[PDB]
Design a protein around this ligand. Structure first.
Ligand SMILES: Cc1cc2nc3c(=O)[nH]c(=O)nc-3n(C[C@H](O)[C@H](O)[C@H](O)COP(=O)(O)OP(=O)(O)OC[C@H]3O[C@@H](n4cnc5c(N)ncnc54)[C@H](O)[C@@H]3O)c2cc1C
Lengths: 1205, 112, 56
C-alpha cells in the first residue's frame, strides 16, 4: 500500500457549511466577538424591558440545608465534610434497620474506624464543594478523620442521624431526580402538572470497554421504554424525553477512530432513535469535548437523512455557546433541518468543559483555545446564537438551557409577543433551576415552558461527575445570586453593552496564557498540530505523502565533507517492503579522524560567544517548527511512530533547542570553558528529540560534537544535523557518524574525546564506563559521562483512585510507542480490593487498541523497532506463559506480517520480584497488594535499583505524602500518566540503575558540559544540613580551622532543599526539588582531603563510605553521634554499595586506578569527582556540589477531581 | 505560650492542647492532625508484621496515622505579622514496660 | 486583656471539643504567681473550670 494514502480521509466531503465550522475552530477571540455583539444587539426599549424582567425574577429568587446542619451542631467546614462522608458510607449499607443499629450501637459510641479497604473520604472533594463551595483536587484524609472523631465525640448519635438524613435527601432527591428511571418518572408528575416537562439524563459517559458501552446502551434502551410508556402519547414538546452522550455508546469515540464510530456507534444511536420515534419522545444528543463536536455532526447528518427515522421530530442536539464555532454549527444544523425536513430540537447551552479545554489546548501547544476565555464573551455568544435560533423557529425547535435570569429575560423579550407551545422552550437543571423557572412557567408568570434536565442514577453513578456539574464558580450566576456582595444592578447588567464598550472588543483574558506563551519571556513554547481539525488532517496528509517521496540519506558528515563507506537501505519497521532511505556507515578510521578534526576546531567554536551559539539553537528550533510536517513523515516511517507521538517528538526537539539556548543566555560566561570534543550517542526510540537534546546542549556549551545516531534511525539524525548546520553550526563543530557500536566504541576510546553523552541500555553504558575509566583528561581528571538508561517503572493505584482515569493512564503509559519509552509503565500495582475490577476494565480497554503500520491516524500502537527486539520481547512473554502466569494479548491483523510487531500484553505476576529483567516492549505486568503492605511494596519498587519514573493514583493526601516521601525515583507523577516529560517542566532523568544525571531538560545539564560549572538560574537554598553544621563544629574543636570554614561555606553553597514550582499548563503543578543522593563513596588520600570530601558530602545531605585502605581512620576520632550516624568505613567497596556518587583525592595515576576500581563496582554507574591534594588546597570548588544532590521532578494533575480551582 | 526543658511541662497555655490535660480522656483539638507518617514508625510496623505481632503492627500503623507530628499551621492574628504553630518530636522518651506487648505499644507511640 | 482572652479562648475551645466522654479530673489546685496576678490566675482557673473541674 502506498504510504499515507489512507492517513485520515474525512467521513464525508466537507461542505461549505462544514468548512465554515472548521475555519472557526481556534479563531482569535478579538475576531469572534464583534459579529456576536452585532447579532446580540437589541433596541433600547427591549433592553430596558429585559432589565426590568430580570430584576423582577432576581427579586423573587432572593426572597425565597447542609448550612442549617453546620449551624445546629456548630460544625467546622472539615467536620461538615467529614460528616457527609460518614453519611455517604452509612448509606452504602442497604438495610435501614442494620444501618440504624450500626449508628446507635457502634458508630455513635466512637471507634467509627473499626466498623467502616476504602477510605471514608474518597469522595470528600465533592462534599467539600457542597459544604464550602471550594474545590480541592485531593483529600486531607487525616484532617477529616480528626474532624469526624471530634464531631462524633462532641455531639454523638443526633448529628450522625441528621447527616444521614441530609445525605439521603441530597443524593436521592436533589442531585438526581431519582435512583431509577421509574422513581424519577413518579417524582416528575408534580412539576409536570404545573407546566414543566422533563428530559432524563441516565448519567452515562465515557465508556472504557465494549462491555461498558453495551451496558450503557441497554440502560438507555430500558429508559426509553419507561419514558415512552409514561409519555403516553403526549408528544415531543409536552411529554418527556431522554438525553444521551455518544461517548457512553462506544469506547473509542474520537476523530482518530471515525471509521469505527460511523460503523459501530451510529447503528446503536439509530436503534435508540427508532425506539424514541415509536413512542414519539425527544432523544437529545449531549455535547462533550471540543474535539468531538464536528465528529458528532457526522452522526447527526446521517441520522437526520435516514428515511427509517422520518416522521419523527424528536431528535435533538446540543450546541455550546462557549465555543467559537457555535454560530457556524447552528448555521449547519438549521440547513440540515431544512434539507431533511426534520424540526431538529436544538438545546443551546453555554458549556460544561471549560477548565479542561483550557488545559488541553495548552498541553497540545495549539494556536488558540476552542472556547472563549472570558465568561462575558460566552454570555454574548449565547445571546447572539439565541437570536439566530429565534429567526428559525419554523425549521428548528430552540431550547434555551440557562439558569442566568439576565440571559433568560433577554431571550424572552427578544422572542417577542407571539408564542405557542412548540415554538421554543427554556430548560433548567433538576434541583437547581426550579426556583427561577417557577417564576416563568404558567399563565400567572411569563407563560413560557421549561424542560427539566433530570439526572437519574445511583449514589455511585451520581458521584462520578458531580464535581463537573457543581462547577459554583465565582463567575457563575447561581454563585452570584447567592452572594450578598453582588447587587441586583450587577446581576441584570447587559453583557452585550459591557463588551461593546470595552477598549478592545473580545480581548483574551489577561490571566490565561495562550499555549505559545506558556513560559512568558523565558522562551517560546513549541507549537503542536490539532489532529481533530479537518484542514490540518488534509494538509498533513499531503505533507506526509510528499515526505515518503524524498530520497532520504545519512552519510558520515566529517568536518572536511561527506565520506564514503558501506551503504545499505533503511527499512520501515512496520513494513520491511517500504524502503525509507539509505545510510552510509562510518569506518573506524574515519571516526578516529573525526575526533581529531573536532579537536582541531574546538578553539574556533569555543570562541563563538555563548549568545551567538544560543542564536544558532533558536534558529534551528524555528527550522524544525516550519519543517515539522516533513519531519513527522520521516519519524513515522523510520522509527515506527504514530503521528501523534511524532508531533510530540518534534516538539520535544524544538523545546530542547530553545530551553538550552535560554539556559545558556542565563549562565555561560568566559570562565566556563568547554570540555572539548563530546561524543553524543543517541537511541532509536527518540531518534530526533534525545539526539537533538544531547547535541544541542554540548554545542551551546562550546563543545564540538561527534554525533553517533542509533544504527536503526540514522535518517532523522542526518536531517537533524542538516538543520543545525543550516542554522549556523559549522561543519567542524557538528559531525555525523552513522554506524553500529564499533563507531560508538571508536569514538569513546579516542584520546581527544573529552566527554560522552549516552542514552541507551545499561549494558552498553557500563561498557562505555569501563572504556572511559582507562583515560584521563589532559588535566588528569576523569572524562565526564552522562548516561541515561532504562527503568523498571511502577504505578501504584489505591482504592480511592477512579478506575476509568487509571485505565486510560495505564493504557497510555504502558503501550504508547509500543512501550518503547524509557519512561514506560512496566509494573502496575493494584490495591487488592479494587484489583479485579480495574483489571477487567484494563483488559477490555486493551482489546480496543488498533495495532498496525503507523501511516494511518487510526493506529494506536505501531511496531517495535527490529526483529531482534521482537524476538527478545516474545521470549519473555513465553517464559511467563510457561510459568503459568495469566497472559492477555490482543490479536494482530494479518497485515502486521510484513513488519515487526508485538501485541500489547498484560501479564499477571505474583510478586514484583517475579520480574527479573527490563522488557522494552508493550508488556505490562500487574501485581496486587494489601493496603497495610503499601510501605513494603514501595520498598520492593525501590529494591530493583532502578529509579526513573513512578506513578501514583490516589485522592488521599496521607498516601501521597507517604509514598512520595519513600519512593526513590527521578520523575514522579500523581493522578496522570507517567510518560512524555516536558522540557523545562518535568526535567527528566532518574537515579540508581536509571542514570547518572544531571536531568535532561533541566537547569544543571549544561554545567556538566563545561570545565567549571556555572550557577544555574534559581539554584540556591537557605537550608543548611545540620550534620554538616555538627561536623564543622567538630572540625573547629579539633583545631582544623581552615577545614571548618570550608565546611561552613559548603553548607551555605549547597542547594540541598531547593524547592521550586515550574511554570506550565493550568490544572497541573510541576515541582522541582534537590535532595541528597544517598551514600557517597569517599576515596581520600590526606586527612585534609578527607575533611573537605566529608564536608562536601554532608553539606549535600549524604552519608559516606570512606575507603578503609586510606589509613585515615585516626583522623575521625570522637565524631559527634549525628555525624557518626552518616559515616561508615569500607574495605570491600562492592559489598557496601550501592553508592550514589564518589569523591576521589590523588595524583593522576591514583585517580585513574581508583576510577577503574569504581567502574568495576556492580550496579549503578557512579558520578565520580576527582581532585589532587593541591587542587583541594587551591580551589574551594575542587568538588562541585551540583553533582552531590539528586534532582526530583514531580507532576501532579490538579484537575483530577473533575475541575480546576 | 510555654516552653520545654526547665521551662515547663506543657501543654502550652492559650493553645489547643491545654484543655485536654484537664480531662481524663483528651479530645481531638481543632485542626490537630498531620498527613506525615514517621518513617521509623513505618519500619517498626513492618518488623512487627514480620514477627506475626499482628495486633501490635495494627496499633503502630494507627499511631502513625493519628500522630499530629509535622502539623504546621498559620494562626489568625494581626496584619504585618505571621504567627506559626508547629508540632515537633519531643526528644528521647523514657519507656518503662512490663511486658513485651506493652513495650511494642510504647515504642509505637513514641516512634509515631 | 489577656485575662479576657483566656476566658474567651478556653470557652471557644470547649465549644469545639468537649463531649460526654471527656470526663473531668476532679478538684484542681491552681497556684498562680505575682507577676501576672490576674491573667495567669484567670487562665489556669478558667481552663480547669470549663473542663468540668472544681477549682481551689
Ligand atoms: C438543561 C441543561 C442541559 C445542559 N446540557 C449540556 C451539554 O450537553 N453539554 C455541555 O457542555 N453543558 C451542558 N449544560 C451546561 C451549560 O453548558 C452551562 O455551562 C451551565 O449550565 C451554566 O450556564 P448558565 O447560563 O446556567 O450560568 P452562567 O453563570 O450564566 O454561565 C456559566 C458558564 O459560563 C461559561 N464560562 C465560565 N467561565 C468562563 C470563562 N472564563 N470564559 C468563557 N466562558 C466561561 C461556562 O460555560 C459556564 O458553564 C446544560 C445545562 C442545562 C441547564
Amino acid at each position: 500500500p502506498a504510504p499515507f494514502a489512507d492517513f485520515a480521509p474525512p467521513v464525508r466531503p466537507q461542505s461549505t457549511l462544514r468548512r465554515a465550522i472548521t475555519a472557526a475552530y481556534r479563531r482569535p477571540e478579538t475576531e469572534c466577538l464583534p459579529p456576536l455583539v452585532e447579532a446580540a444587539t437589541q433596541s433600547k426599549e427591549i433592553r430596558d424591558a429585559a432589565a426590568s424582567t430580570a430584576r423582577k425574577l432576581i427579586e423573587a429568587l432572593r426572597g425565597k440545608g447542609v448550612e442549617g446542619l453546620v449551624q445546629e451542631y456548630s460544625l467546622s467546614s472539615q467536620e461538615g465534610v467529614a460528616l457527609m462522608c460518614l453519611a455517604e458510607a452509612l448509606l452504602r449499607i442497604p438495610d435501614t434497620a442494620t444501618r440504624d443499629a450500626l449508628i446507635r450501637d457502634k458508630i455513635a459510641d466512637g471507634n467509627w474506624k473499626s466498623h467502616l479497604s476504602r477510605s471514608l473520604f474518597v469522595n470528600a472533594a465533592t462534599w467539600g464543594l457542597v459544604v464550602t463551595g471550594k474545590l480541592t483536587s485531593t483529600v486531607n484524609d487525616r484532617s477529616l478523620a480528626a474532624a469526624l472523631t471530634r464531631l462524633i465525640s462532641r455531639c454523638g448519635e443526633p448529628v450522625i442521624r441528621r447527616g444521614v438524613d441530609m445525605a439521603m435527601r441530597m443524593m436521592g432527591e436533589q442531585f438526581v431526580t431519582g435512583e431509577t428511571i421509574r422513581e424519577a418518572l413518579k417524582r416528575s408528575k408534580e412539576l409536570e402538572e404545573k407546566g414543566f416537562s422533563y428530559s432524563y439524563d441516565m448519567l452515562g459517559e465515557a465508556a472504557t470497554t465494549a462491555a461498558d458501552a453495551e451496558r450503557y446502551y441497554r440502560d438507555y434502551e430500558s429508559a426509553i421504554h419507561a419514558i415512552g410508556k409514561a409519555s403516553a402519547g403526549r408528544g415531543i414538546y409536552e411529554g418527556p424525553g431522554i438525553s444521551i452522550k455518544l461517548s457512553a455508546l462506544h469506547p473509542r469515540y474520537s476523530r482518530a477512530q471515525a471509521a469505527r464510530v460511523m460503523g459501530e456507534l451510529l447503528p446503536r444511536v439509530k436503534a435508540l432513535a427508532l425506539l424514541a420515534k415509536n413512542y414519539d419522545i425527544g432523544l437529545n444528543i449531549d455535547a462533550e469535548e471540543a474535539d468531538r463536536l464536528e465528529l458528532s455532526l457526522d452522526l447527526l447528518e446521517v441520522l437526520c437523512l435516514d428515511g427509517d427515522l422520518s416522521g419523527w421530530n424528536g431528535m435533538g442536539f446540543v450546541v455550546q455557546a462557549y465555543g467559537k464555532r457555535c454560530p457556524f454549527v447552528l448555521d449547519f444544523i438549521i440547513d440540515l433541518a431544512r434539507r431533511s425536513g426534520r424540526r431538529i430540537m436544538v438545546r443551546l447551552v453555554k458549556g460544561a468543559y471549560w477548565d479542561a479545554e483550557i488545559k488541553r489546548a495548552q498541553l497540545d501547544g495549539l494556536a488558540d483555545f476552542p472556547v472563549f476565555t472570558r465568561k462575558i464573551h460566552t454570555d454574548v455568544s449565547y445571546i447572539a446564537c439565541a437570536a439566530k435560533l429565534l429567526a428559525a423557529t419554523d425549521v428548528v425547535f430552540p431550547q434555551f438551557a440557562t439558569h442566568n435570569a439576565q440571559t433568560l429575560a433577554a431571550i424572552y423579550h427578544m422572542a417577542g409577543k407571539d408564542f405557542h407551545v412548540g415554538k421554543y422552550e427554556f430548560q433548567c437543571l433538576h434541583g437547581m433551576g426550579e426556583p427561577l423557572y417557577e417564576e416563568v412557567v404558567g399563565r400567572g408568570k411569563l407563560d413560557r415552558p421549561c424542560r427539566i434536565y433530570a439526572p437519574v442514577g445511583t449514589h455511585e453513578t451520581l458521584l462520578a461527575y458531580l464535581v463537573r456539574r457543581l462547577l459554583g464558580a465565582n463567575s457563575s450566576f447561581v454563585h452570584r445570586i447567592n452572594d450578598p456582595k453582588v447587587s441586583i444592578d450587577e446581576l441584570i447588567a447587559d453583557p452585550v453593552e459591557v463588551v461593546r464598550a470595552m477598549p478592545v472588543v473580545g480581548a483574551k483574558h489577561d490571566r490565561i496564557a495562550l499555549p505559545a506563551e506558556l513560559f512568558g519571556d523565558a522562551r517560546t513554547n513549541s507549537a503542536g498540530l490539532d489532529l481533530s481539525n479537518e484542514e490540518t488532517l488534509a494538509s498533513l496528509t499531503e505533507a506526509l505523502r510528499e515526505s515518503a517521496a524524498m530520497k532520504w540519506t545519512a552519510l558520515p558528515q566529517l568536518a572536511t565533507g561527506p565520506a564514503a563507506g558501506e551503504t545499505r537501505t533503511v527499512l520501515n519497521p512496520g513494513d520491511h517492503r517500504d524502503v525509507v532511505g539509505s545510510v552510509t556507515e562510518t569506518s573506524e578510521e574515519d571516526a578516529r579522524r573525526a575526533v581529531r578534526l573536532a579537536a582541531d576546531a574546538a578553539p574556533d567554536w569555543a570562541a563563538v560567544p555563548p549568545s551567538e551559539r544560543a542564536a544558532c539553537l533558536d534558529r534551528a528550533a524555528e527550522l524544525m517548527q516550519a519543517r515539522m510536517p516533513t519531519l513527522l513523515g520521516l519519524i513515522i516511517r523510520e522509527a515506527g511512530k504514530s503521528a501523534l507521538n511524532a508531533i510530540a517528538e518534534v516538539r520535544e526537539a524544538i523545546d530542547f533547542l530553545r530551553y538550552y539556548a535560554e539556559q545558556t543566555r542565563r549562565t555561560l560566561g568566559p570562565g566556563h570553558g568547554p570540555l572539548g570534543p563530546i561524543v553524543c550517542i543517541s537511541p532509536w526510540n527518540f531518534p530526533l528529540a534525545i539526539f537533538t537534546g544531547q547535541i544541542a546542549a554540548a554545542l551551546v556549551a562550546g563543545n564540538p560534537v561527534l554525533a553517533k545516531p542509533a544504527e536503526e534511525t540514522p535518517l532523522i539524525a542526518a536531517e537533524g544535523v542538516r538543520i543545525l548546520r543550516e542554522a549556523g553550526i559549522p561543519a567542524s563543530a557538528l559531525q555525523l557518524l552513522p554506524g553500529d557500536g564499533r563507531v560508538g566504541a571508536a569514538l569513546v576510546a579516542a584520546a581527544e574525546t573529552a566527554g560522552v553523552m549516552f542514552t541507551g541500555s545499561t549494558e552498553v553504558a557500563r561498557l562505555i564506563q569501563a572504556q572511559l575509566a582507562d583515560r584521563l583528561s589532559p588535566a588528569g581528571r576523569p572524562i565526564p559521562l552522562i548516561a541515561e538508561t532504562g527503568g523498571q517503572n511502577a504505578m501504584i493505584v489505591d482504592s480511592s483512585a477512579l478506575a476509568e482515569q487509571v485505565v486510560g493512564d495505564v493504557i497510555t503509559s504502558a503501550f504508547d510507542s509500543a512501550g518503547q519509552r524509557c519512561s514506560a509503565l512496566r509494573v502496575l500495582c493494584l490495591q487488592e480490593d479494587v484489583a479485579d475490577r480495574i483489571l477487567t476494565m484494563l483488559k477490555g480497554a486493551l482489546h480496543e487498541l488498533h495495532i498496525g503500520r503507523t501511516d494511518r491516524l487510526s493506529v494506536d500502537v505501531g511496531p517495535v523497532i527490529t526483529s531482534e527486539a521482537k524476538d527478545n520481547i516474545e521470549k519473555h512473554i513465553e517464559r511467563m506463559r510457561g510459568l503459568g502466569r495469566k497472559v492477555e494479548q490482543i490479536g494482530l491483523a494479518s497485515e502486521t506480517g510484513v513488519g515487526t510487531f508485538v501485541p500489547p500484553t498484560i501479564i499477571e505476576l505474583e510478586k514484583l520480584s517475579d520480574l527479573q529483567r527490563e522488557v522494552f516492549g508493550p508488556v505490562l505486568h500487574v501485581i496486587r497488594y494489601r493496603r497495610d503492605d503499601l510501605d513494603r511494596l514501595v520498598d520492593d519498587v525501590n529494591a530493583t535499583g532502578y529509579g526513573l519514573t513512578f506513578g501514583l493514583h490516589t485522592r488521599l493526601d496521607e498516601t501521597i505524602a507517604h509514598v512520595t516521601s519513600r519512593i526513590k525515583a527521578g520523575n514522579l507523577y500523581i493522578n496522570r500518566n507517567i510518560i512524555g516529560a516536558v522540557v523545562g517542566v518535568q526535567p527528566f532523568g532518574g537515579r540508581g540503575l536509571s542514570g547518572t544525571g544531571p536531568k535532561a531538560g533541566g537547569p544543571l545539564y549544561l554545567g556538566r558540559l563545561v570545565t567549571t560549572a556555572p550557577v544555574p538560574p534559581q539554584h540556591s537554598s537557605v537550608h543548611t544540613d545540620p550534620v554538616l553544621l555538627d561536623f564543622a563544629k567538630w572540625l573547629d574543636g579539633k583545631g582544623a580551622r581552615a577545614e571548618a570554614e570550608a565546611a561552613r561555606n559548603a553548607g551555605s553553597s549547597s542547594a540541598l532543599g531547593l524547592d521550586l514550582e515550574l511554570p506550565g499548563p493550568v490544572g497541573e503543578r510541576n515541582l522541582y526539588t534537590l535532595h541528597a543522593r544517598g551514600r557517597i563513596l569517599l576515596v581520600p588520600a590526606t586527612e585534609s582531603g578527607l575533611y573537605h570530601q566529608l564536608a562536601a558530602a554532608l553539606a549535600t545531605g549524604n552519608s559516606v563510605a570512606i575507603d578503609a585502605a586510606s589509613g585515615l581512620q585516626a583522623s575521625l576520632k570522637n565524631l559527634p553521634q549525628t555525624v557518626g550516624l552518616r559515616v561508615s568505613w569500607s574495605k570491600d567497596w562492592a559489598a557496601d554499595g550501592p553508592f550514589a556518587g564518589a569523591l576521589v583525592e590523588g595524583d593522576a595515576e591514583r585517580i585513574r586506578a581508583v576510577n577503574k576500581a569504581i567502574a568495576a563496582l556492580p550496579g549503578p554507574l557512579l558520578l565520580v569527582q576527582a581532585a589532587s591534594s593541591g587542587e583541594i588546597a587551591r580551589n574551594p570548588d575542587a568538588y562541585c556540589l551540583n553533582w552531590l544532590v539528586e534532582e526530583v521532578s514531580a507532576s501532579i494533575n490538579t484537575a483530577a477531581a473533575g475541575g480546576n480551582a
